Amino acid sequence: ERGASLQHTAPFGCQIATNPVRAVNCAVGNMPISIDIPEAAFTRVVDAP
Amino acid sequence: SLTDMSCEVPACTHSSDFGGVAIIKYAASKKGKCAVHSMTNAVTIREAE
Structure with missing residues (x-):
């Protein structure tokens, strides 16, 4: 009588795992990303084609 | 020239x-040494010749 579990019914495309109990990849909203890229990774316009 | x-x-x-960094393309009349200078006071060049 339990019906479908949270893995199947949860909004935002949530994946449900156990040991420990957790909600993975919740299909819902947006996610801000901040990347502090080091100086060495960049190439100057003059040094670029 | x-x-x-x-x-x-x-x-x-x-x-x-x-x-x-600045790349300057030119057409010189002959081989020789040329002086390099910034005509704008807000900018200074490392190379003198």
Whole structure:
């Protein structure tokens, strides 16, 4: 009588795992990303084609 | 004698040191040494000759 579990019914495309109990990849909203890229990774316009 | 001069800045960072890079294409009449100087007081060039 339990019906479908949270893995199947949860909004935002949530994946449900156990040991420990957790909600993975919740299909819902947006996610801000901040990347502090080091100086060495960049190439100057003059040094670029 | 220099003619057909063009200038491109592939990399620039405004700082106390030489953070700017400039590539100058030219057409010289003969081989020899030329003096390099900035005609704008807000910009200074590392190379003198």
